Nucleic acid binder design. Structure first.
Ligand SMILES: [Mg+2]
Ligand SMILES: [Mg+2]
Ligand SMILES: [Mg+2]
Ligand SMILES: [Mg+2]
Ligand SMILES: [Mg+2]
Ligand SMILES: [Mg+2]
Ligand SMILES: [Mg+2]
Ligand SMILES: [Mg+2]
Ligand SMILES: [Mg+2]
Ligand SMILES: [Mg+2]
Ligand SMILES: [Mg+2]
Ligand SMILES: [Mg+2]
Ligand SMILES: [Mg+2]
Ligand SMILES: [Mg+2]
Ligand SMILES: [Mg+2]
Ligand SMILES: [Mg+2]
Ligand SMILES: [Mg+2]
Ligand SMILES: [Mg+2]
Ligand SMILES: [Mg+2]
Ligand SMILES: [Mg+2]
Ligand SMILES: [Mg+2]
Ligand SMILES: [Mg+2]
Ligand SMILES: [Mg+2]
Ligand SMILES: [Mg+2]
Ligand SMILES: [Mg+2]
Ligand SMILES: [Mg+2]
Ligand SMILES: [Mg+2]
Ligand SMILES: [Mg+2]
Ligand SMILES: [Mg+2]
Ligand SMILES: [Mg+2]
Ligand SMILES: [Mg+2]
Ligand SMILES: [Mg+2]
Ligand SMILES: [Mg+2]
Ligand SMILES: [Mg+2]
Ligand SMILES: [Mg+2]
Ligand SMILES: [Mg+2]
Ligand SMILES: [Mg+2]
Ligand SMILES: [Mg+2]
Ligand SMILES: [Mg+2]
Ligand SMILES: [Mg+2]
Ligand SMILES: [Mg+2]
Ligand SMILES: [Mg+2]
Ligand SMILES: [Mg+2]
Ligand SMILES: [Mg+2]
Ligand SMILES: [Mg+2]
Ligand SMILES: [Mg+2]
Ligand SMILES: [Mg+2]
Ligand SMILES: [Mg+2]
Ligand SMILES: [Mg+2]
Lengths: 113, 223, 145, 115, 118, 55, 337
RNA sequence: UAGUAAAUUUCAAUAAGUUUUUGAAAUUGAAAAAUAGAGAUCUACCUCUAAAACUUGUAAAGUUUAAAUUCAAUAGAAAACAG
RNA sequence: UUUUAACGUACCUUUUGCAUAAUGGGCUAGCGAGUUUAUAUAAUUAGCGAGUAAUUUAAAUUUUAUAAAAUUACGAAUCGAU
RNA sequence: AUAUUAGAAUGAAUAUACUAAAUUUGAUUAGAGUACAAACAAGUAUUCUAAGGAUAUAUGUCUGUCAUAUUGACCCGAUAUAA
């Protein structure tokens, strides 16, 4: 068959039982590993954007704005910054986060409360 | 299918080097041998699971296939349509040789126009190869005739006999069986000169059509 | 026997102007390739004498010019340009054989005579679309091969 | 040049027939004279050829036949129909291409002119 | 074209006209080449009655056309060459223009720099 | 109408052949309509020669 | 020159020149053009003749030069180089004298009993009707090997042209060298080997030598695993390819050219041309004549009488004279044109 | 090579499913080259032939040897001592 | 190598359609299925070209190049129940 | 637009249809071709050309019936016969 048998046994080293040695189980259980991975990679770029929001949506409510009206100004504003960094900032570099948060409020004439 | 792409002008035949003529440094020009994908031998090839046969029908089987007679029990084209008359009876006909061939040779030097043209003179020159039952002077390329000619053949037609005699010349039609023709063309095999026949009715009725065309005729006359 | 009905009218419509052809742009490339104006010949031509006997017409003429390529007659004394067809005669091509020398200088000169038609170089011959036999033999004699 | 030639690539005679084309009192009258087992050759289909006559040059071939519903009942038909029978009817391409295969010898003129 | 069918019917549901000829089955053929003209007129009591005439003018030549062009070379065939056609200029295709990819982001090189070589 | 403009003369040799026939057909049809006698103009069934006229 | 094949070839004369001093060169056209233009373009020039030296046969490189040259023929040694024509030769030769007799066994030829080992129903296992089938024990292949025959034909004017190409390559590649004569004082292998090994140790050599050989040579060249000899009559494309070098003697070259220059004519023969015994056929009766019948004929002696041995001719001769008397013989005489 | 040649009904093999010829079963049975028979039924004309025997060694399976074409132990043979 | 988080109902066959509680396989190694010959037609790469195409050389007895040989087969002419 | 228009039903016609009458056999022969429809084969309407007739101002009209169904392939065989 297509993938050699020296090659199946690499993709199925740490499998359970007869799903590592024998062929009538290993081949379809390696194939699903690769159908899943092709899927889990395009899903990988989804989950982080769910995380990047979820860290921003809680670091920004300490400053008494919610997520939606924050980025609403961010696109109005001149600034290009991503949701990636704004996550990394609020954790690791928090002072600069409040800086960025201020002009965004101001260039949009937004007023927290 | 049979259809294959012509080799373009952009595809190189050479191999970018000057290699010797050894039994290893040989090749032939591409497009000279198509290679069919071996059947039944892989998903990756498009003909593995089934060798292009299909799903389970009759043509999918060993020895599967109806003939080009069959139409589903429906009555075929043969036993439906009517039957026609008889085929030819005179299967033993001369050939038709256009002036465009005998005159082509004369302009070369393969034939002497000053001598009577015969069947052998055309055989040796290379006008034709095989001729049982003689020759006919069916006319295409009449207008190229430049000089007087003197033919001696088995048959001819109206326009040629006319178009020759305008310039001059003549035509003499002869009756000869194959055993006589083959004495004329291949004299080496018939060292005994053969008698002349006396022909039956059917030869006469064709041979009198010829005399009506203004030709000359040679055959043993019946009483 | 004279026709009638539509089978005569169509037979008479050759003497009427045409209705212009809507065409795929692939033709529009071709007619731009084919109607492209001519160019001068790099190798000049010598005239055929008049009142030449047919026994002499089949003979060659003497070359005057120093040419890179040559073309050979047969073992019969005729020029090796021939026509080719399908089984149904829908592809119609002339052929040339027994070529020597720089072929690229032979195609540049050939394409001038055939109104810049498609040329298919093959091993030992050159196929060209369109029956243009008489035009070539009138050109090769007129050079003296 | 073959240093050794087999016996089976030589001529092969059939089985149910004699070893000679002549007989004596002691010979057999069930079995027949001798023959040669040649390799199969697709033969022209003798029925087709009697329903057809062949037409045209080697590069555009056509098949002439006579139409049907012409012989038994004639009283029951219009002059137009019976006059639409007398003419030629050349075969249709969809049937002509099923039928080349039953005529391996078609383009040979010696076959055509006899048909 | 003449001897061409314009209608098949049962009775004169579409009446005939001029330059035609009807048949046994009340068909409607034409008599000469041209264009059709359906004419209708009303009777005393609002009956629609339609005819099938033809306007006997001629018709476009879509069937027998001359052959395509060819350009004979003059010093080979000069007499054929006087009648040569002029070169067509057909707009086969439209010239496209590429997309200009940004280049600021692919940074620039520095020459004769300083480093912490080891 | 005539197509003066050039074309491959042996590609489309039939086109030359077809044209010359149509031109002959015109002249064959004009000469008759000039030289014909009014008997020949009529259809068949009135070209005939009866002795006794009607009544 | 494909033209001028239908004319009969006159006897061949080497146009030798005596050119002392240095060994003349012969310029190969550039390699690049011979790659892109490898079928339209010759290896060497065609108007300029091929002045090729004639060297000794037992003599080293620098020291071997007589002082003479030959002018070879373009049609044989200056044709375009076409592997297309050679490849279709080699596949032909390899398959003309070949038969395959090996056969593999089918489901029928294989031993067995032609029954069912067990019925279909109630056994709880597969349907195994026929025995020794493919896939099963001692099975026979359904699509195995068969006995057959591999000879197929090839057009004859390219069994020819595939030789002229090769000789036009050994001269062009560099290899072939011309020889004055094959001639050795002794029939002993000591003569060739000593001068040969220093000349060329590694080269499978071919030599083409005339019909009339020297006996001193035929006994010596054998035992030498590198060498191989051929008459010009028999020179196959393979023998030039299998062997690296090739030598040609001066007199044998007349015999080779006059053969090929005739072997074309036999094929290219416009029918109105008259052939006959050619110089290639005539030179092969002088050497190996064919035994002819005896010239012993009898002449009539009108002075003396006749007496035949066969009883019938007597009775046929006696009745003959009787009809001279009566004058009835003329009934039997004929006059057919 | 006179109970022969040939004939009538049937069948066989002759390419032919039918109308010959060559032979067989049953029944009848001739002449004397001046005669007799075939030539796709019958007639005429003409042509051809002469109805006796004998004669082409190696065919075949099996063993062995030499060579070519092939397999290399789930192949080749059923069997690398196995009918 | 373990734990956690999210996602996720095998495979082949057959079918309008199956995780299917529809068929089939206890796993592993090895055997295991479009092949051979001939004719005709088409297309592709080539040879020669109004001409083209040879090997019952299956031999010769040291043992060869496939050395001849175009009789023959196809061919630039079709129309008609004949 | 009913009456009707040979018979089922639809469609259409009203110069239809119905009715009276005088002359008459176009309910004839041959050859070429388009169009509709249409897998194939089959079926349908009819102009144009030629011969030979009827009608009778003909100048012209008619190649079975108002229309659509009112039947059957090919083979084998048959009567009359323009070969
Ligand atoms: Mg997204
Ligand atoms: Mg697929
Ligand atoms: Mg599978
Ligand atoms: Mg199946
Ligand atoms: Mg199915
Ligand atoms: Mg199927
Ligand atoms: Mg079957
Ligand atoms: Mg099929
Ligand atoms: Mg009939
Ligand atoms: Mg008829
Ligand atoms: Mg009408
Ligand atoms: Mg068995
Ligand atoms: Mg079980
Ligand atoms: Mg069984
Ligand atoms: Mg086995
Ligand atoms: Mg083969
Ligand atoms: Mg030849
Ligand atoms: Mg029988
Ligand atoms: Mg039989
Ligand atoms: Mg009998
Ligand atoms: Mg008897
Ligand atoms: Mg007898
Ligand atoms: Mg008889
Ligand atoms: Mg007879
Ligand atoms: Mg005997
Ligand atoms: Mg092992
Ligand atoms: Mg084992
Ligand atoms: Mg075993
Ligand atoms: Mg889950
Ligand atoms: Mg099923
Ligand atoms: Mg189901
Ligand atoms: Mg499906
Ligand atoms: Mg599901
Ligand atoms: Mg379960
Ligand atoms: Mg089930
Ligand atoms: Mg299941
Ligand atoms: Mg099932
Ligand atoms: Mg199970
Ligand atoms: Mg298993
Ligand atoms: Mg088990
Ligand atoms: Mg396995
Ligand atoms: Mg009715
Ligand atoms: Mg009604
Ligand atoms: Mg009638
Ligand atoms: Mg349609
Ligand atoms: Mg039809
Ligand atoms: Mg009807
Ligand atoms: Mg009527
Ligand atoms: Mg039947």
């Amino acid at each position: 068959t297509g993938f050699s048998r020296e090659k199946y046994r690499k993709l199925a080293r740490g499998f359970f039982g007869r799903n590592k040695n024998c062929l009538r189980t290993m081949a379809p259980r390696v194939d699903k590993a690769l159908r899943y991975s092709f899927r889990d990679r395009r899903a990988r770029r989804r989950i982080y954007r769910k995380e990047w929001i979820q860290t921003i949506n809680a670091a920004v409510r300490e400053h008494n704005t919610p997520y939606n009206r924050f980025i609403w100004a961010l696109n109005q504003s001149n600034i290009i910054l991503d949701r990636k960094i704004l996550s990394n900032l609020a954790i690791n570099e928090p002072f600069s986060f409040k800086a960025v948060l201020d002009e965004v409020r101001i260039q949009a004439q937004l007023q927290s409360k | 299918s049979s259809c294959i792409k012509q080799r373009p002008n952009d595809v190189p035949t050479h191999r970018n080097e000057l290699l010797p003529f050894t039994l290893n440094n040989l090749w032939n020009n591409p497009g000279y041998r198509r290679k069919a994908k071996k059947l039944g031998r892989g998903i990756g090839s498009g003909k593995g699971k089934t060798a292009g046969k299909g799903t389970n029908g009759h043509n999918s089987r060993s020895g599967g296939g109806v003939s080009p007679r069959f139409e589903g029990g429906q009555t075929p084209w043969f036993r439906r349509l009517p039957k026609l008359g008889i085929t030819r009876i005179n299967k033993e006909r001369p050939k038709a040789i256009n002036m465009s061939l005998i005159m082509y040779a004369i302009h070369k030097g393969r034939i002497d126009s000053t001598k009577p043209i015969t069947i052998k003179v055309l055989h040796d020159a290379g006008v034709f190869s095989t001729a049982k039952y003689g020759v006919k002077l069916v006319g295409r390329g009449l207008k190229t005739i430049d000089r007087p000619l003197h033919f001696e053949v088995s048959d001819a037609s109206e326009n040629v006999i006319k178009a020759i005699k305008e310039k001059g010349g003549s035509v003499k039609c002869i009756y000869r069986t194959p055993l006589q023709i083959r004495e004329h063309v291949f004299p080496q095999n018939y060292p005994i000169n053969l008698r002349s026949t006396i022909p039956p009715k059917r030869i006469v009725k064709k041979m009198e059509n010829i005399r009506e065309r203004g030709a000359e005729v040679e055959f043993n006359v019946p009483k | 026997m004279r026709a009638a009905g539509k089978k005569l009218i169509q037979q008479q419509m050759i003497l009427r102007p045409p209705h212009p052809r809507n065409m795929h742009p692939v033709t529009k490339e071709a007619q731009n390739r084919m109607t492209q104006p001519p160019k001068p010949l790099e190798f000049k031509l010598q005239d055929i004498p008049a009142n030449q006997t047919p026994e002499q017409a089949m003979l060659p003429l003497g070359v005057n010019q120093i040419m890179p390529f040559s073309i050979l007659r047969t073992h019969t004394g005729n020029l090796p340009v021939y026509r080719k067809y399908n089984h149904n005669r829908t592809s119609k091509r002339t052929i040339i054989r027994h070529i020597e020398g720089d072929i690229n200088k032979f195609t540049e000169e050939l394409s001038k005579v055939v109104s810049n038609a498609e040329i298919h170089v093959k091993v030992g011959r050159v196929e060209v679309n369109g029956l243009h036999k008489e035009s070539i033999d009138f050109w090769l004699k007129r050079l003296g091969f | 040049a073959f240093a050794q030639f087999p016996k089976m690539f030589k001529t092969q005679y059939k089985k149910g027939r004699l070893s000679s084309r002549f007989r004596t009192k002691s010979s057999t009258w069930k079995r027949g004279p001798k023959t040669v087992l040649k390799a199969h050759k697709q033969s022209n289909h003798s029925a087709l050829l009697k329903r057809i006559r062949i037409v045209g040059p080697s590069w555009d071939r056509k098949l002439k036949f006579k139409s049907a519903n012409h012989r038994h009942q004639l009283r029951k038909k219009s002059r137009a129909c019976l006059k639409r029978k007398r003419r030629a009817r050349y075969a249709h391409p969809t049937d002509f291409k099923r039928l080349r295969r039953l005529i391996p010898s078609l383009k040979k003129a010696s076959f055509k002119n006899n048909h | 074209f003449p001897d061409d069918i314009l209608a098949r019917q049962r009775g004169f549901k579409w009446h005939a006209g001029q330059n035609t000829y009807v048949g046994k089955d009340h068909t409607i053929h034409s008599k000469v080449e041209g264009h059709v003209r359906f004419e209708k007129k009303y009777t005393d009591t609002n009956r629609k009655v339609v005819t099938v005439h033809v306007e006997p003018g001629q018709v476009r030549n879509q069937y027998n056309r001359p052959p395509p062009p060819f350009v004979y070379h003059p010093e080979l065939y000069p007499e054929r060459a006087v009648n040569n056609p002029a070169p067509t200029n057909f707009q086969v295709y439209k010239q496209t223009v590429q997309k200009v990819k940004r280049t600021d982001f692919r940074g620039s090189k520095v020459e004769n720099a300083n480093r912490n070589v080891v | 109408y005539i197509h003066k403009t050039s074309y491959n003369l042996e590609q489309f040799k039939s086109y030359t052949q077809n044209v010359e026939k149509a031109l002959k057909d015109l002249n064959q049809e004009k000469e008759k309509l000039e030289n014909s006698s009014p008997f020949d103009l009529l259809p068949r069934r009135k070209r005939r020669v009866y002795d006794r006229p009607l009544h | 020159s494909i033209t001028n094949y239908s004319i009969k070839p006159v006897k061949y004369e080497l146009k030798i020149n005596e050119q002392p001093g240095k060994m003349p060169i012969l310029v190969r056209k550039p390699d690049e053009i011979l790659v892109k233009q490898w079928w339209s373009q010759s290896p060497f020039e065609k108007t300029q003749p091929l002045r090729v030296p004639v060297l000794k046969f037992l003599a080293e490189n620098g020291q071997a030069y007589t002082g003479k040259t030959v002018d070879l023929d373009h049609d044989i040694f200056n044709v375009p180089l076409r592997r297309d024509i050679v490849h279709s030769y080699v596949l032909w030769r390899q398959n003309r004298d070949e038969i395959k007799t090996h056969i593999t066994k089918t489901k029928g030829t294989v031993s067995g009993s032609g029954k069912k080992p067990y019925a279909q129903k109630g056994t709880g296992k597969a349907r195994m009707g026929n025995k020794r089938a493919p896939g099963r024990k001692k099975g026979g292949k359904a699509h195995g090997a068969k006995p057959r025959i591999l000879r197929y034909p090839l057009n004859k004017k390219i069994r020819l042209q595939a030789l002229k190409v090769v000789l036009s390559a050994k001269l062009a590649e560099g290899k072939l060298r011309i020889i004055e004569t094959e001639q050795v004082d002794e029939p002993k292998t000591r003569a060739i080997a000593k001068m040969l090994e220093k000349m060329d140790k590694r080269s499978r050599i071919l030599i083409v030598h005339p019909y009339q050989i020297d006996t001193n040579f035929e006994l010596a060249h054998q035992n030498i695993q590198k060498l191989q000899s051929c008459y010009p009559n028999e020179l196959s494309v393979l023998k030039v390819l299998t062997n690296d070098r090739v030598f040609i003697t001066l007199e044998a070259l007349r015999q080779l050219t006059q053969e090929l220059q005739d072997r074309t004519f036999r094929n290219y023969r416009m029918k109105h041309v008259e052939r006959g015994v050619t110089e290639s056929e005539a030179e092969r009766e002088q050497v190996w004549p064919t035994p002819k019948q005896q010239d012993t004929k009898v002449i009539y002696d009108p002075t003396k009488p006749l007496q035949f041995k066969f009883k019938i001719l007597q009775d046929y001769y006696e009745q003959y004279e009787k009809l001279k008397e009566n004058g009835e013989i003329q009934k039997y005489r004929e006059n057919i044109e």
